[model samples]
Target: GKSKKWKEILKFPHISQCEDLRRTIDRDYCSLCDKQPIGRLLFRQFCETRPGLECYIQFLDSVAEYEVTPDEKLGEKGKEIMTKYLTPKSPVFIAQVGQDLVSQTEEKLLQKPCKELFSACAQSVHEYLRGEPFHEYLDSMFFDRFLQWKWLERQPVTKNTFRQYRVLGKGGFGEVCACQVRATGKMYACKRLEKKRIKKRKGESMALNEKQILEKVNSQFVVNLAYAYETKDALCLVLTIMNGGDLKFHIYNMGNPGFEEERALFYAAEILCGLEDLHRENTVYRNLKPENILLDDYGHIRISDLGLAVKIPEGDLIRGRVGTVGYMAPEVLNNQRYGLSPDYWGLGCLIYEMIEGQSPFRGRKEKVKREEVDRRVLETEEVYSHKFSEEAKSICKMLLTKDAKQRLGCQEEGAAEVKRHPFFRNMNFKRLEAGMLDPPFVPDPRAVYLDHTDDDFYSKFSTGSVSIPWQNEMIETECFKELNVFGPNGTLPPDLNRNHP
Candidate 1:
């Protein structure tokens, strides 16, 4: 029995301070930083300051100091360890430990020593301490501090930072316009949400939510937020420039019988990827229509206008009568609680539109009322034209299933299930995601897709002049900051202010 006790004392389980530290490091740093030599340097820096390092080294000292062990001496050694770091006044007191655990440990120390005595405390310490000053330190080391520095150096961005150009489109809030950042000669689509209009419409939450969601998401398949700043009357979201125009423009104005099946399949694949990316971020796009899908210069699509997008909490559902009439899912039209499934339904509608040149509910030659469209969305069984291939019809039918549970992309594999369908069988999704797949049609470079003769009443809303030299210095100082952090060729990173989970 004495020999067994001795063996038990000798067999100390490995305290995984360094292992936990490595996890914390990876969790706190950006993914790109993990590959660089600087990543090791950063880890070293973290080890030097982490409370676990000090506590762990001191733990080793206690083990060495108590070599003359009866079980009682082992108990004494545990006391010493607790006094040095775990007690109330200790230099590295893990204060975040639950009172129950702390009191339990105190009782355990009063009785006998155990190898696992500090394990729970160590976990609690690691969890809480990593979130506090440690995270603040990591943020400083990353690109966040540089972004803040740039913000401090620059005068708060005003309309004058960008040279306003032609209005690209208009909405209830304000107009989306083509704008050039005079500092770097970079062009962006400036989406202006007028504060007064938002207030009048009681859309403050919607406006702010859109801005915040745009800031949080960073995917090549989605229109990315570059900058957000406010003017006297409007909040401007500076977004990626999609010069090829919206999908609606292409479907209606570009030609006759819409896109061919192959072209439609390509677009459907890209849209599926984008929707999946949004869903991965816990955001339901809520609105997916031809009008909201913008084609970049390369002819690839980036879903834009996040005003209707919502983040659904885990295991939760949303019930808002949102989205366009003809494209809304049955669940949405019926005002039933829904999750990301509606987006798949919207995708089905979009694919049908891309092939048929009009929404499934709307006739090519007839205009329909809003109620008629809604009725069709809820009850209509779409009859496919001869143009739809067997694969196309199959995928569309599955996606447009009235029951959200039975929907194509709503299954366990989600977008993967949709991508694997017969319609997308020929698509190389890996290449598509990487944007290496060649698009069927790239928009003409010299052409402006918009009709020049819309009501020019929105023209007066244009503000901002060409940037001055000092303004250029301010903006350019932060231009490469995003590139350095996100990689030179990578998509724009999420807003710097939002904490990564």
Candidate 2:
């Protein structure tokens, strides 16, 4: 029972305290310095050395937030083969963030006479090589649960429980069909991808990339992947059925009429929310257009077909020529590194198209060749229709700024910048995100057929072969080569041709 007062306990004690932040030992030279002369001695900066133990672990957790693409890509015509990708090999420094600090993991160093396997960590951060392997121990197992991760748990739904109905649409790689689940009788849009062809075309990794992204995200404005499974010939993707079809369907068939400014704001705000979700995840949705936006019976929108999406590090850039002929940004055509700004440009184009009743760039020339569109997009100020309102014109001008840096939505505020524009004045974005706002237009449920039978339907949508109908059913050109690189599933339906629009 040591109930003595604090003053009474330390009253006669020697004045002393243990400093936890620094060592008290005196030395002729700094222990961390290697200099023998005053001018030759080197001093490390405060943070150049390791941070506090817990803080370092937090830093490591941020590092782990980046998804490491495998060092190998599955090759065509063989078993999975290794291919060298970007960045560097793993097993690098900070590897032991999770590992237990047990002495057993440092056994090799324990045998050395000069090695100081005495402190909590056997060696300082400076002692380790760039890619030194992490220690394996019980501490790693304990910390594993605390670390952040990017990918989500895979759903158990698979092909056996899903059955296909009439083809919803077809693409260069596979066909999407209306399907029903065996157990719940709930319907979903089942996209069947040919696994054999995917492997043969060396598109297997890219094919799976979309599924990875879809599984990782569940957002109000984005389509959710209900389930995924494989059959003998196909890898089936079960997604929510957006019965109202794509925006293009309504644009062309429903009325073939331009939207009022209020209607445009409604759709634009929803699209902004979807892009915000993607941007938050460090993903670049390379493909964005009217055809990619689908509507549910309730009239809410879902951004679908993420085949061209890539998870990138913030401030990092990726290089590739992808997206539709007319909708692609000029930076995307320069064969250079680009970022998320391109999607903003696509958004502007879609908004203009929705209001103007035709693509802003479509009327440049009689023929919508890829080369002509690219040249026009780079060398022209988008000519908005005379009917464009002042607010809509301001948004278009800002968004269509050719310089990606100066583009409207590409600024630091990102989609918020777009949302703050005067065009969205008085719009309740919070209610929009929550699906509380009443939609201006809702596609009739009874009239919502998949529209599988258009002219040249057999050739354009033949799922029996990977050869696209553009080879035989449509005009072909050298500029069209860039279009072929798209993953099998993201293309627009045959009825809506990008060239003619």
Candidate 3:
């Protein structure tokens, strides 16, 4: 029974977000500075941020007009994760605008820290590290940006009751599969890494590189590492699910992908973009091929299968066979020192295979035939020509160039040269960045078959079964443990093994 006058009460204020937008798209930010606007301040930015404003009249639009229901399960899961790990600490929810802005042009994000141009303190991370060197946190083995982090106060989903299906096919590091939480509808592609397994300790390094690369490299063309949590024995990576299957399956279905310049160039451009990012981070995608390129429901290209990705230190000489036999560049085969250029060459091979109906050089049953293909490559100066369209050949030659320096683009600046070629003259690079490109193929609704032979077969995927090679001995985050599931017992059939063989 304080003052009955509305003026007596202090209202939630709207603070403007940035000085630049103050005159135009004027808005306010939260006092907390997590970039959320305080409720009343949100009323100021009406049309731009809130939208649907016809503010000829002065009354603030009421949120009461909208309908909302309680999400108890999300609330519980949020509560559980928060309690177990973030006890007593406040949880953070960033606005969708911040997520979209930063995640959008990440190359620019990486090139410059938000601190230089904006208020560093405005963005709240763990406040303890506020004064420490930003480079230290940036260089740490851990991922920097974490969204929707719930303190692990309690476990939401059952630990062992989840199920798994084999999503990824043969030829990756260990058996890779997709997992689903039975209690909830959430699905994840779980890569089961065999910790003890290796071609060398290099495999361990590769796993670390893969995690590092995925953490930093976020693009529509790139496959995302959505959720990663570890078990006591193995580490788990929950990636974005591509219901449409991979490039290999698509190529196989087409009997051979078409020689159409536009279609081939579209995927080639995207893959090259991914390769460009991978190289910029000083990482080598040792494995590149149709088999590794996963497609989303719309048949948009995403580079997956990081089993062999290795991070290269700047100026470090890299060599040896890094990728598949057919896709491996000559420099890698000759054991000559090389760098990021190899993946680009592999990109060319993939583009060629996408058009020519077969690998440009190898893949005819035996290692000897593959070697002949390599030797022939060593002799021939003109490896690609009119057999493939001049546009196709132009990109292929640029990618497959013997000289890495003369390859498609410059790594330092992160721009692809292939965009300039006539083949992609009609291709709009702007559309790719703006998320406007329509993928030609649709996701087949069917999750990829774990075994090609099983007519009724759907993959059986799980999580905890696979172990992480490099997780330090600590139970800090329980994300990996809680998300694990046991795949179906009889989901795999016998004929499938012999079918591929």
Candidate 4:
């Protein structure tokens, strides 16, 4: 087999070179090598080209039936699977399958053979994986060679790789700046977290957690992480650049009375989708506010600032007095253990603020204390202004329900329950998730949105060297030679020119 040479070339070939190579190679390469370990690895790479495919693959593998000739041998296989994947203590356990299914499967494992052990659980997971969106990812491609090339060719990205520009925004730990990759000339927002600040605030875990969560999640509704690296003083996260600024600016700074119902509905739908994806990944986004939701150039929303987001395994709950003052859920303020419902409460506050230009829990007057806001959140009955329509009022009331169980998104179906509410009845959720639906508001291109930072901060920080412009060129050329997939002329493929057009 020429599989060894194939693997060598596939390790880090340029996208255009890889595409060219694929055109010349046998189409049945994957099927021909399927039985081998390299083939399975390649298959995994193919499946993982999309975000949720790997999760589905994990579910399928966990419940796959193993054939056994003898009836006694079937029970052994059942026990092995039960111990490996169905048990809560197992490292590879699939948490998204739900505790009820796991319990039912465990009971079946005691009474049934391996063939029938996970039939019900498998059926449920199979139905979910076979449904819309997931099926689209599965049916779309045999393999994404471009994504494969990107993954294989990834080098250790550093601060030197990016040409840092103006500061976009400042956060608790650091500043986010607009930066461009020198080699690719692609724009991205670089969030730089200072090691000193993290250590001082004892927020090392939060910083690491945010990075890990960003890596796990890839959704149109959420700000995506492109690359992560660390400098001597800062941890840098290169993320999707949202040039349209955050929702708070649009809601507050863009004149009073906030947005119309139509605009609010579009934004709320996107934020809900982001939250749903986060929840599916076992994360609870404790922080959901206007400031955390950013707008892209198309005016589509993406949830950002995930430092307060925490991952809780299935059937688990979290308790903390975290989150913003007015947006914090009553359960959080009450010191009660809760799940994803708090984010729904925060979303309710966000929607109210979007329409009314003020927080639901805040007084009509300006400037309320944290204690007053928390007190109101615990006991106040929010009065809907004339701005709220019938559907909007109903959805807000349901989401802001003080009891976690009675909250809008707290049910077994999670986001589906919220999506079906009358407030979002008009929305085509599938189209919305696919980003096919047009947004209500596009930010003015002429508007300047960024907050300026002091030059002293830039001077003290190491923002890479000007003298090492050729270093990146050397790196690219070195990789090209190592892979040697370039055509006879030793130039970038013709498709590389097509990328600019």
Say which candidate scores most in TM-score: 4
| Distance from true location, Cα of 181 in model 1, Å | 2.1
Which runs in model 1 stand beyond 4 Å of their true positions? 1-27, 31-156, 450-501
Clashes of each: 0, 4, 31, 0
lDDT of 2: 0.58
Worst 10 residues of 3 by lDDT: 141-150
Find the 10 residues in a row with the least total lDDT in model 1. 9-18
List the candidates ranked by lDDT, beginning with the highest: 4, 1, 2, 3
What would the per-residue lDDT of candidate 4 be over residues 1-501, giving only the tens digit for each residue?
A: 122243343354334444554455343433322322332443454556555456556656655534322355767777777677667877656566788988887777667664566777766665554355343432333233333333443445677667889888798899998987665455778899976786667666677678777767867788777677667667788777887878998888883758998789999999999999898998989899888899888889999889898898789888888987778898888889988898899889888888888888885466868788888898888889789899999999999998889999899989989999999977867567766778887878767770134233423332232111222222333532343233354344433333642
Which regions in candidate 3 have their CA more than 4 angstroms from the true location?
Answer: 1-173, 181-184, 195-203, 363-368, 382-387, 410-414, 447-501
Per residue, candidate 1 scores C-alpha lDDT tens digits across 84-117 of 7667777765556777777887887787676556
1-501 per-residue lDDT for model 3 (tens digits): 112231211111112212232233222122111222221222232222212222210111111110111222333333332233223232322222144433442333334322121122123322321223222322221111110111111123233534677646544456668786443345656766654453334354556556666765656677766445544444556666677777776666754444455667778778877776676677777688888888777778888877677677787866666666667777887778877777777777788887766677654233556667777555555455454777667777777787667776534444555667776776766556544677766676765541344212111211122211111100112333332211255232221222332
Q: Local distance difference test, per candidate?
A: 0.68, 0.58, 0.50, 0.70
Clashing pairs in model 4, backbone N/Cα/C closer than 3 A:
none
Superposed on all Cα atoms, model 2 deviates from the true structure by an RMSD in Å of 25.2
In angstroms, the error of model 3 at 9 is 36
Among all windows of 10 consecutive residues in model 4, the one with the lowest summed lDDT is 465-474
Query: Relative to the unseen true structure, what is the C-alpha lDDT of residue 69 in candidate 2, on a scale of 0 to 100?
Result: 15
Name the weakest run of 10 consecutive residues (lDDT summed) in model 2: 145-154
State the local distance difference test value for candidate 3.
0.50
